[PDB]
Design a protein around this ligand. Structure first.
Ligand SMILES: OC[C@H]1O[C@H](O[C@H]2[C@H](O)[C@@H](O)[C@H](O)O[C@@H]2CO)[C@H](O)[C@@H](O)[C@@H]1O
Ligand SMILES: [Au+]
Ligand SMILES: [Cl-]
Ligand SMILES: [Cl-]
Ligand SMILES: [Cl-]
Ligand SMILES: [Cl-]
Ligand SMILES: [Cl-]
Ligand SMILES: [Cl-]
Ligand SMILES: [Cl-]
Ligand SMILES: [Cl-]
Length: 373
């Protein structure tokens, strides 16, 4: 549709609780008479710049914070200025994830970290270690099962392994990220992707498995483990798989370091409904009842709102999510992050498919990222 004064349009990814957010929309409309339309288009993070200037696109856009600094660089985001009373309702470190060049450019919603999810019936004692997965897959294959399936088409899911032995995106040193110091082809990064590719070479994993195939196999009881975030928990609840959430496997003794995202709601700088957007986000979404309605649809993870997080922290699944988050790092929000994801995605896909060696896939990824900053 088209952006119009008097009504809100919200974009959020299809794997999130858009039906729950729509319930918050209905509450807002009952209170204010302002209809709220929640859409989940494909490739919404790539479309938002090409539509904000034309007058399409949303009033409010949800995504992990890593993309927002590139949006702010093009002026697509409105500066958010909550007063001290509202800022204190969210954890300080989540505000930092949406601060770009001194200005807050979004509202933090929830904190996302990948975890090892496993079938308690197929696997009462899951492995603590990547190195013991092949032997486990061999034993499960003889019973008609597999050990591990997760999305190999998005580098997000492979990055905890790559970073375990020392891979990193942009080196952070004393205040800022060094955009010319990229760490995707260093020794640790190469050792991580190499281990992944040898799982595939030895038929302990399939290069073509994406999100749906990984989810379906685990939720049907065909694979013993998957790697996913909290949004996936709802579909597992429905499947009636006795599942647990636990610490990611280690590699060469070191923990996997997932890239941590803060799901954030930015306001289109050209929105005719700036105030309504802040009103909706501050007074309806970022409340105990609002986050509850979204979380019941698809779990958010560690919510940024402290009052609601103190209740969710008692859940062992959330405790495991936080533990994996403490071992990883929070993503940078700098504009160079889109070049980083694009290039690492090619490296992972080429290496897994055999189109390239692990070494030259990561060396090519390194060259592309460094040259473009
Ligand atoms: O794989 C590259 C992308 O990784 C993350 O995207 C995550 C996102 O954080 C999460 O909420 C969503 O449900 O899953 C995707 C992975 O497909 C970064 O946030 C993106 O910017 C990257 O492009
Ligand atoms: Au957490
Ligand atoms: Cl639906
Ligand atoms: Cl502005
Ligand atoms: Cl903090
Ligand atoms: Cl800053
Ligand atoms: Cl910086
Ligand atoms: Cl090195
Ligand atoms: Cl996919
Ligand atoms: Cl961190």
């Amino acid at each position: 549709m088209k952006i119009e004064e008097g009504k809100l349009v919200i974009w959020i990814n299809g794997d999130k609780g858009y039906n729950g957010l729509a319930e918050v929309g209905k509450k807002f409309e009952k209170d204010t008479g302002i209809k709220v339309t929640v859409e989940h288009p494909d490739k919404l993070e790539e479309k938002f710049p090409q539509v904000a200037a034309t007058g399409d696109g949303p009033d409010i856009i949800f995504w992990a914070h890593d993309r927002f600094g590139g949006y702010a660089q093009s002026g697509l985001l409105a500066e958010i200025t909550p007063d001290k009373a509202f800022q204190d309702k969210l954890y300080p470190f989540t505000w930092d994830a949406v601060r770009y060049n001194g200005k807050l450019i979004a509202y933090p919603i929830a904190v996302e970290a990948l975890s090892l999810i496993y079938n308690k019936d197929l696997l009462p004692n899951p492995p603590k270690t990547w190195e013991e997965i092949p032997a486990l897959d061999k034993e499960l294959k003889a019973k008609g099962k597999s050990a591990l399936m997760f999305n190999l088409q998005e580098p997000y899911f492979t990055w905890p392994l790559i970073a375990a032995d020392g891979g990193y995106a942009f080196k952070y040193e004393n205040g800022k990220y060094d955009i010319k110091d990229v760490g995707v082809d260093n020794a640790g990064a190469k050792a991580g992707l190499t281990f992944l590719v040898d799982l595939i070479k030895n038929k302990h994993m399939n290069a073509d498995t994406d999100y749906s195939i990984a989810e379906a196999a685990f939720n049907k009881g065909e694979t013993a483990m998957t790697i996913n975030g909290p949004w996936a928990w709802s579909n597992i609840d429905t499947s009636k798989v006795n599942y647990g959430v636990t610490v990611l496997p280690t590699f060469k003794g070191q923990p996997s370091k997932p890239f941590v995202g803060v799901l954030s709601a930015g306001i289109n700088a050209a929105s005719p409904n700036k105030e309504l957007a802040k009103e909706f986000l501050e007074n309806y979404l970022l409340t105990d009842e609002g986050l509850e309605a979204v979380n019941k649809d698809k779990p958010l993870g560690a919510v940024a709102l402290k009052s609601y997080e103190e209740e969710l922290a008692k859940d062992p699944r959330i405790a495991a999510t936080m533990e994996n988050a403490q071992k990883g790092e929070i993503m940078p929000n700098i504009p160079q992050m889109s070049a980083f994801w694009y290039a690492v995605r090619t490296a992972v896909i080429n290496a897994a498919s055999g189109r390239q060696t692990v070494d030259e896939a990561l060396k090519d990824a390194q060259t592309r990222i460094t040259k473009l900053s």
